[PDB]
Structure formats: C-alpha cells, structure tokens
Design a binder for this molecule. Structure first.
Ligand SMILES: Nc1ncnc2c1ncn2[C@@H]1O[C@H](COP(=O)(O)OP(=O)(O)OP(=O)(O)O)[C@@H](O)[C@H]1O
Ligand SMILES: [Mg+2]
Lengths: 253, 253, 63, 63, 127
C-alpha cells in the first residue's frame, strides 16, 4: 500500500514524484485530530491546495477569439478544409496577409469535419496582451496544460496538472501520451472521426520568445514532432513571417 | 460523546513525535557528545552482549545515550515519559497522577542498582517527567527536601511520596536525586512551528518540507516493522534530509 | 511482550490513512459524480438543517 | 468594505502564503479564550511567530 | 547607499521589490501580507502583486471617493544598469512600466536625462 499510492499519483503529474504520497497522507491524518472536529470533510479545493496549485494553473490561458454573426458566402474554405484531411501525415500551414480573415476562418473550420470529430483551438495573440509578463502564452508549460485539460474537460483523457521544475521533454511526452487515449475514444463510436489541433497566430509566439532572449517557442518544436495516427495539425501565419517557424521540407503550404 | 475520547488519543502521538523530532537535531552538532536516541524502548545494546533488563521498560517514551550506546560505559543516560492532556492545559496535576509513573521508575531503578553499584549509577542516570500542564509545587518541595535531607514543610506530600516509591531514608534521597519534573511545555499549535524555526538554522534558507520528513522518520521508528532496531543516528538524519558527508566537505585541501 | 501490542495499534492507523488517501484522488476527475469524503464521522449536513442521527456512528471509518 | 478583509479563491502564492489570514484569526481566538495565562495581550513577537516568518523575510530591502 | 552591486545586497529582482512594496501596504492594514517561496516564477509574483493593489485601493475609496494610491520608484536606471552588468536583461521596472494597473493608482519614475532610454517607455508615457 505504501508504494501503490506513488504509482497511482504519478498519473496526474507529468513526472514521478516522491513528496505527494506524504502530503495526501498528512492531509488525511490532520482531518483525524480534535482540532478539525468541527468539519471532517475533504473536497477538491483541499486536495489541490495540498498539492499546492489552484484552478488558474489548470487553465492558464483561455481562448479569446471573437466570433461574428455576419459571414459572407466565401467558397474556398470548404475545399481548403478537405484538402487538410485528404493530405494526412504532414503538418499543414495556411498563410494570408493582414485583415483577410484567418482568425474568423479558424472558428468556421470545425463544421466541415466528418461526423464524430473534435477540434481544439488555441490562441497565441490574446488581445495584444501576449507581450506582458503576467500574460505570456508561448511556453510549453502553458499551452500543453491548456490543451490537455480542455480535452480532459470534454471527457476524453486524464487531467494534467503542473509540477515545478519539470522540463520540456516531460511535458511533450505527457501530451503525446494523452493524444492516443483521446483518439481511441473517438474512433470507438465512429470509424472515421479525426482529432484536430488549430494553432492560431503561430508567428507571434516566436517573436515573443525572441524578444525576451529565448529561441524555441512550443510551436517551433511541435511542428517537427510526429503525432499519433488520426491527428491533424494546422498552423496559420502571415506570408513573410513564415520562415520564423521554419517548416520541414515535408510540410504542406 | 465517545468519538471525542478517540480523537484525543491521536493528539498525544502528534505531540510526542514533534517533541522527539525537535530533540533529534542535536545529532548534527560537530562538537557535542550525544550519540543515540531510542524511541519507545531502551537500547538493545544497553548491557552490551548481556541480555536486556525488562523491568519498568514500558514507561520509556524516549531514551538518550551520551558517549556510548551502552550503560556500562556511557557517560550519561536519560529515560523520559511524556503526557499531553488536551482540554485542561492550565490545571495543575495532583500527586495521585505522578504515582503511576514514579512506581515504574523505582521498578527500573531497583533492577539497575542490583547489577551496577549505586556510586556509579548516581553519576549517570536521570528520570524525566514532561507534560503540558503545571505540577503541584508542594509535592516538588517534598521531592527536593527528600533529595537534600531536610525536614519538609508538607509531611502529607512526603508520606504520599514514600507510599509511591516504597522507600525511606537516604535510599529515598538518592532516588529523588534522579527525578526531574518539567511542566508548562508549549502546546501542539506552537510545537508545530517551533520545529520549523529551529530547523531553519542549519539550512541556508527557510524550508517547509523538513518538519514533515523528521516527523515521518520518528513515526516510522514507532511501528512494528522497526522493532528489531529502534535507534536514530546521524546518518539516519542526514539521509532523511537527503545528503551525505561528501556534501558537507565537497572539496578538501 | 506488552509493547508488541502497543506497536501493532499504529500499523492499523497507517493502513487506514494510506487506504483513504488512495480514495481521495477521485475528486480530481472532471467528469465524475463523487462529491465528498468524511473521515471518522458522517457529514454534519447529512440531514440538511435537521439534527444528525447518532446511532451506529462510531463504526464509520470513511463515508 | 471599510473594515473586513476576505479571501478570494485565487491570487495567493502557494504553501506558506495561503494560510496567514486563517492564522491571524486563530491567534486572536486562541488569545481571547486563554485568559488563564499570565497575560492575554498580543505583541509583535507573537504575530511574527504565528506567521512563521522573520522580519527580514517581510522586509528584505529597507529604504 | 552604493551597495546595489554587491551580491548580498541586490535590489533589482521582482521577488525583492514587489515583496517590499506589498508588505509596506500590508503593514498599514490595507492588504494581506505577501511572503516569498523558493521556485516561484516571475508571472506568479506579478499576478499576486496586482491582486493586492486591487485590495488596497478598494479599502481606501470606500471612505474618500477621490483618493489615490501613489507608487514611487527612485533611481530607476540603476536597477537596469545592475541587471545588465551581470548578464540579465529584465529588471522589475522594465516590465512593471508596461503593465496595466487598476483605476485610482499612479506610477512615477525618476532618472537622469542621458540614461532615460535604458527603461524604454511606451508611446503612452508622459515625460
Ligand atoms: N467571413 C467574414 N464575414 C464577414 N466579415 C469578415 C469575414 N472574415 C473577415 N471579416 C472581416 O475582416 C476583419 C479581419 O478579420 P481577421 O481578424 O480574421 O483577419 P486576419 O487575417 O486574421 O488578420 P491579422 O492578420 O491582422 O491578424 C474582421 O474583423 C471582419 O470585419
Ligand atoms: Mg489575427
């Protein structure tokens, strides 16, 4: 029993840990004294503050892209979305210059997928707040946690909750592990469902990384990584900033 | 209620472990003579190779050995007994309480005096009583006057002391020369943070996991699995904190 | 010996706390219906505002 | 608003920062009903020991 | 007093300045005290600071509806000079000057004329 707890607790964290089995036991023990006799209950907030995080750490960067009611008939998008699914096995990049409708199209793309499909949409721009210290959006430990907990909220996989000092490779492995679980769940009920990841404003993240002296924003690694079978990845940028995110030769433009 | 009397049993163990953990730090001093702590039982090497004296053993909460882990050659030895009354912290104890401890102290004293002569043991041996509550002053005065051979002002308390010990004259006096009373200890709510303040002196910064780890070490000495060896030494404390001797001397001359 | 029977009392509490701690993790599931654990006593809100039933209460390790 | 401070569920730093609001209230409640001690007052030393910090942890760089 | 370039006496990290200012408001009764933690990143310190600004001004304007809170940074250029002299680039003020504060607070900095561009003001700034 003393070690089964370590093995089960290691699933919610991105890495193996040896202090959490102590802290949960201490919480349970301190509920069993006289000082807590007024309230012997344990709730979710108690467990989270035992581990040392709050709900903001599970959702560090919510979506902000504006939806619109008017939508002029615009014929290309229905062809451009099927061009993605019928060209699997490679990352796809869409580009167009200022004020042409990339961010609106990112909200429309989800309706044309085959039935049973699920799409995750991420925003790297916010509303121009991405350059402020309290509002960075470009680290691994923000975007990957966001997307994992959005899939878990929809009921596809386990939560992923952050632990201090964890490096980039552990977060990459923890994310890629949960993609497989989600796609198995989707392709149980229907034979041809897809799981689609949309990264809007991919070129802002690398500018924000390079401004503070870093060199590898998360999308600059994710584009060359290899995803499990049945997963789509699409990135959108302006045409002259495209070389910052440096696609491999196999990419589709 | 009944559950109150079950809950109040746990607070005593919490007090015991915190108070022992504060004592365990002294093993780290580089120019001090303390050598061993034993938790809930005397040292198995107390009489060297010869079998252990079992009389009066179960009053032993904590035992401390200086110089050697062996009564025949140690410089000083202490045996200690603790009490944590929860809801009456300001109310003095009567001698009818200390009776039940004094009886066992005399029982151990007799068997120790039989094997090793008095003129040796009188230099080494102490019995302590440690409690949250204050203790009857007149009874202490009777203990003092018995230990110093003076006519006490409170003959009833001296008669009670004689009834508890079953000794009179100088043989009582010698026994009262080994009896130490320590009341008015800080309560559990204070003990829980005094340990943090004292442990912060050996570390370069404030820490909040070390008071857990020392308490866990003390607690795991108190189970059945460690009954073969209840001792705590310097190496145990260092591997509880997670370092070894090389980390204290990383670069010799 | 006598001390054996005192030491064997602590192992039961250690077992109890570890086994309850393994149960407490289920509160983190985002699509599961569990709402509360109470340790050594039933919930004080069990009958809402009405006073609590005390019969058979002391067998309750976990609720 | 003019007199009472209350905790939100967000914004506090983890571990030792989270429970200072509770421990000030605990200290006051403890002092009021421990009138049997030598004195029931509160002074600065008891506040600092209640919080667990030293003065130089609160004020690392004076003006 | 000229100590800000000695290793035991730095003054240009977030976890020194923001802790100082938060506890100076908290000691006066306007907010809860802010105590540091080892391993915490800078964004957590920023959010925890803004929360207690929001507490303090709400305490003050419930009694005087046109009161303000003033925060002053003296010798702002020295904090950036000390940071760049040891290989960092972002002292606390260089981030704090571009952050958006609650209503009813004002922010003032002072520097020498030939050093002003070290702290790089945004176009909204007043000189
Ligand atoms: N389908 C549409 N129907 C109606 N108006 C649209 C549509 N698509 C775009 N627009 C208009 O064009 C504006 C610019 O759109 P959007 O923000 O998507 O452009 P963008 O290419 O992503 O811009 P940027 O490159 O500057 O980030 C919208 O605010 C809206 O007024
Ligand atoms: Mg856009």
């Amino acid at each position: 029993q003393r070690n089964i707890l370590l093995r089960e607790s290691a699933g919610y964290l991105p890495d193996l840990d040896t202090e959490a089995p102590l802290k949960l036991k201490e919480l349970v023990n301190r509920k069993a004294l006289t000082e807590s006799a007024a309230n012997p209950s344990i709730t979710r907030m108690d467990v989270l503050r035992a581990l040392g995080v709050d709900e903001t750490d599970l959702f560090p960067a919510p979506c902000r892209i504006e939806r619109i009611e008017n939508s002029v008939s615009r014929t290309q998008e229905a062809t451009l979305v099927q061009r993605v699914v019928e060209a699997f096995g490679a990352p796809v990049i869409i580009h167009a210059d200022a004020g042409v409708g990339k961010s609106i199209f990112s909200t429309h793309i989800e309706e044309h997928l085959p039935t049973g499909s699920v799409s995750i949409l991420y925003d790297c721009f916010g509303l121009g707040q991405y350059r402020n210290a309290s509002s960075y959006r470009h680290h691994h430990r923000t975007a990957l946690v966001q997307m994992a907990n959005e899939m878990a909220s929809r009921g596809l996989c386990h939560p992923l909750i952050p632990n201090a000092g964890t490096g980039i490779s552990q977060y990459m492995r923890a994310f890629l592990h949960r993609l497989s679980q989600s796609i198995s769940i989707l392709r149980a009920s229907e034979p041809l469902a897809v799981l689609c990841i949309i990264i809007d404003a991919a070129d802002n993240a690398q500018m924000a990384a390079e401004e503070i002296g870093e060199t590898r924003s998360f999308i600059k690694d994710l584009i060359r990584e290899k995803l499990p079978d049945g997963v789509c990845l699409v990135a959108l940028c302006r045409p002259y900033r495209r070389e910052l995110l440096d696609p491999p030769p196999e990419a589709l433009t | 209620s009944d559950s109150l009397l079950v809950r109040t049993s746990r607070d005593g163990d919490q007090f015991h472990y915190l108070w022992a953990a504060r004592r365990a730090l002294r093993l780290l001093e580089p120019q001090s003579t303390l050598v061993a702590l034993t938790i809930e039982g005397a040292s198995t090497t107390e009489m060297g190779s010869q079998p252990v004296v079992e009389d009066g053993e179960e009053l032993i909460d904590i035992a401390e050995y200086y110089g050697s882990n062996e009564l025949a050659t140690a410089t000083t030895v202490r045996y200690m007994q603790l009490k944590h009354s929860t809801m009456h912290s300001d109310t003095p104890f009567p001698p009818s309480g200390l009776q039940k401890t004094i009886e066992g102290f005399a029982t151990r004293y007799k068997a120790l005096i039989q094997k090793i002569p008095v003129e040796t043991l009188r230099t080494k041996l102490e019995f302590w009583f440690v409690t949250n509550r204050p203790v009857s002053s007149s009874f202490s005065e009777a203990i003092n006057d018995a230990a110093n051979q003076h006519v006490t002002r409170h003959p009833h308390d001296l008669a009670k002391l004689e009834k508890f010990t079953g000794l009179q004259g100088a043989e009582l006096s010698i026994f009262c020369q080994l009896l130490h009373i320590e009341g008015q200890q800080d309560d559990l709510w204070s003990q829980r943070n005094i340990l943090l303040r004292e442990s912060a002196g050996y570390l370069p910064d404030l820490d909040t996991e070390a008071p857990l780890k020392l308490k866990e070490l003390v607690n795991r000495k108190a189970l059945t699995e460690s009954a073969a060896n209840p001792s705590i030494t310097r190496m145990d404390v260092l591997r509880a904190l997670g370092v070894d001797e090389t980390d204290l001397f990383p670069a010799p001359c």
